[PDB]
Homo-oligomer: 338 residues x 4
């Protein structure tokens, strides 16, 4: 009785999901990747599965054939279909659910192509509009029903923010808040200054030698995940020169007067596999490979009070790649309970 | 009638002040460096004056003798006195004011040693307590009198924050606010993880491969510069891997309801050599070599409103090295009007 | 009286050539850029001309129209023709010579399209086969004749290597040699690990956090520039995490017994605007903005001798972007003597 | 039955040796660390043992007392004696051998102080002159006898170079050769440009934004390890912006005519735990955590031939921290056979 996963797009997230699923399969969870769909040569995909500059070397023998990646002598078929309804992984490989990572299928309407191939459910690894559910595991996975065939995982930043916001909202109420995520550079940024698809003047700039402000949607979209905070949050990002590892700061007005210790005790109550409480004075390197969606840092909590007014700053780390990945894998497991 | 400057400590800031003063001397301002005091070999100091990895090569011939740096054939004496009262630069070189950059003289009581050597006034390049004035040029230099012999320039971060806070306070009122400065790594951080003087667990970590949270004093000390905001601000920093170039975010509750455009127009009114208005979608690299203390970025201004509550985010860039340096040089010029 | 230049492809090199030509135009040189051809929106191109993370801010007012870049109120037409024979810059703008920077026209046969548009000569900013001349200014520009309509500048690395090799060959003879260039990352490298066009396993890897070995052609192609060394050199590169600034090491067997001092004096004899002699203990940052093709470093010269055998290591810095650019601009000036 | 180790100096290498020894202890090896001597607060040392920005988080519970580090509930005494003869770890903790990592004891005469404390043998983690043996495990450990009480491990670079040189010398003969190691920055380099202890103009420069040439001793000292190559090698380094991971290139004249394939097969014959053969197109990140002293890369081997002359370039990766550490640990194990 294994949940069988097809990965559409073997990019950074897809590969890490492959690694994560194999690790959980070793710890007896009933889940496996059975097939991949990607237009890149399998040899190149195998090599990128094996060697990662951020996440280390995969501790398994990895090779390839003409049409597969091989891991510890087991074949994983790599199809090369630009159109999802033509991937035969349901009948050939037993795919139940698809992790949709390509960027080309980021809406309810587009990803229905997988359902035409006999796929039961699709989890899109990106925000995908508001005519489907956006799920942050540990916050709102219980809103999923048998009828939810296409689901968004939101963004990496939504999965960092929502657990912290959820705890604050339940314990104190949030009236209004603004986020800044100090964030690792990502693969679509430019290595040196040059024209970028879309024409954005900041996306065009050398990523590993600049602090670069960037627009985000995770705070304005919080209402998709926690409806009672719809329209109460906003934010942005600063892209900085680390290759992975990010931190989300939230400054809030709460419905109640608090102390920093009180805030921190409240976060500790919501500790779970998706929401870690990390008091050991860590830096971004220490966060790489963490499996929680959001790693709350009580050492950075600050309450600033003047007269009757109070501002509350709460800070969560995340591995913008692996935290997000592991949140998605938990959501894929949750699909089997539907 | 030149203001003659002695520099105590030819560290990064001292050297950049030397460069800045020479540049202003070329543009006819009546100011010059006449002498330096530093325990390092002059040859090494000359080389670091000439070549800088962040600020480029100084466009002048630079060499040294046993006891001097030579710039374009002119000698600048390098004394090597661990005790300031023994530096003979007043009688030998005509020093009026001292730029105190060593870290060993960061109080009113310690820097009085310069006054024992016949120095008229001392500007300390760091926060130096509250029994002397902390001056951010363009904000409170007019509080200086003839009696102010020892003065603090505050920190680099205070000089980024105070012009923006000053404008907001005059136009709207600030009730409470919290800062985060996303900040370049500095010379006292560790290149690789290892023990650091003091034992701080975060200061110990590799600086160019981590986002590292850091305590700051610039927001809590704002009352020294703008007394009516005493106790109303707090903040911290995130040290990230750029060698220079920083940005200060302030989230405020204002005494009045506003729009982002209204906030930005208000900042534009206070534009000056110390406070630049920069709407051209810049990144940190573009800020290197800027001469303003604070470079307001209207593209990052955000007003988040929910019900009757409003949070206002305002963002200022700064060259944490050169912005600070140039603010200090303006303050040294102001000393001649006392 | 002015040599008028059209730039095809306004990429990093094209933009730097624009800057370099404007700087030389300010110093009296009879040369100007009159038009550009590029498919990118002019506004984006103008912004990247103005702001560069490596080379600083261009000290001119820069804006754009729908079809031009504007610099200090002067219009520079941006055409958007995918086929070079359709660019009307000869009749409209008086283009004499084209700097060909697109990558799409890197052969004698392809770049002839410019000649069909009435262009007198084309300099290709890349190695372009062996049925045309490859010119490294200061080494073999005097092989050009009136009949040379299409010319290669070689690569950035050829321009760093050839001056040094030339001096060694004339003074001592080279019998055999091998190069390693420790080289800045470039715009076609990946920011994070992922599939790359071509499938190269190393080109796929995160560029700013790895030392990455890379195949080069500059040593094996030296026979195009210095025919007597055809087949005597080979080499490779190590790509490292600096955004610009590179160094070329050559290990040689020379036809004569030498000392390090003798080698260094020999290089000093060939000093010129294209070949600088730099004894001041510089590092890569100091090399950024240098205008020579090759900056010889006598502090790194080593001769290792055992019995009758001798190995000679000679080292030249270069700004892999701007050194190359300025070499090309000197070659465009040389075209006017044909 | 266990070889008991005392570590003098719990710096980057000492801590990694602690990790390595604990890992080998888990795999049955009869070796353990029993005590440390270091002047730093144990709490700080414990934190740096646990969290490393390069080598990841140590997978053990780590805490401290006033005088110990605690790992998985087991106490490791931290003494704080500036003089080695006063450390009581022989009688208190059963120390057999000392790993000497402080820098203060880098000669035969100085480290004899440990022998006065009842220590059987000392391995110094650095080159330590020529009146003691310099041992590179897998090359010359069999020259050790019962009389060798104080031993040098050489440098990190000697351990990368010697295995490769050894194989070349045995199979082909080396007549002369020159090394360049493209090398990670180290803890004694400057984060930003400033004066450095010793006055070196290059050591003074910002390490994570420059290629910096650096003098080395590993090639000139090869005669200590392989006497027949005394005086036949020389070399230097280029420090580049990676925090760990290095590569050593050797260009040689061999006593015999060869092909690249022949060279690579010859290296494969000497493969061992100290000397790995790595054909999988790796980059420096993939080398982090490797346990071999030298990781030969056959993809970079080049033979350049012209007439009767031949240059042979061979390339070995190394984790300049952990490769060196693991070599030292193999040598400490070898001490038990004496």
């Amino acid at each position: 009785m294994t949940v069988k996963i097809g990965i559409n797009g073997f990019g950074r997230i897809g590969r890490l999901a492959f690694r994560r699923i194999m690790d959980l399969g070793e710890k007896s969870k009933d889940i496996e990747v059975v097939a991949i769909n990607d237009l890149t040569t399998p040899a190149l995909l195998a090599h990128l599965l094996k060697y990662d500059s951020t996440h280390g070397t995969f501790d398994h023998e990895v090779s390839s054939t003409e049409d597969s990646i091989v891991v510890d002598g087991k074949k994983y078929r790599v199809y090369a279909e630009p159109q999802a309804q033509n991937i035969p992984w349901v009948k050939n490989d037993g795919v139940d659910f698809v992790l949709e990572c390509t960027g080309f299928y980021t809406s309810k309407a587009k990803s229905q192509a997988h359902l035409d191939a006999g796929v039961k459910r699709v989890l899109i690894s990106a925000p995908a509009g508001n005519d489907l559910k956006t799920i942050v595991y540990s916050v709102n996975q219980d809103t999923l029903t048998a009828d939810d065939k296409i689901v968004s995982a939101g963004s990496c930043t939504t999965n960092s923010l929502a657990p912290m916001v959820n705890a604050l909202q339940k314990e104190f109420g949030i009236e209004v808040g603004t986020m800044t995520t100090i964030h690792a550079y990502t693969s679509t940024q430019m290595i040196l200054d040059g024209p970028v698809r879309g024409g954005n003047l900041r996306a065009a700039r050398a990523a590993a030698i600049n602090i670069i402000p960037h627009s985000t949607g995770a705070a304005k979209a919080i209402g998709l995940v926690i409806p009672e905070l719809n329209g109460k949050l906003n934010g942005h990002a600063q892209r900085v020169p680390v290759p992975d590892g990010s931190v989300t700061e939230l400054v809030s007005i709460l419905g109640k007067n608090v102390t920093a210790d009180e805030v921190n005790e409240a976060m500790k109550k919501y500790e779970s596999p998706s929401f870690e409480y990390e008091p050991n004075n860590v830096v971004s390197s220490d966060i790489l490979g963490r499996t929680a969606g959001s790693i709350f840092d009580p050492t950075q909590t600050m309450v600033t009070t003047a007269g009757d007014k109070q501002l509350v700053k709460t800070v969560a780390w995340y591995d913008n790649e692996y935290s997000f990945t592991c949140q998605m894998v938990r959501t894929l497991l949750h699909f089997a309970t539907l």
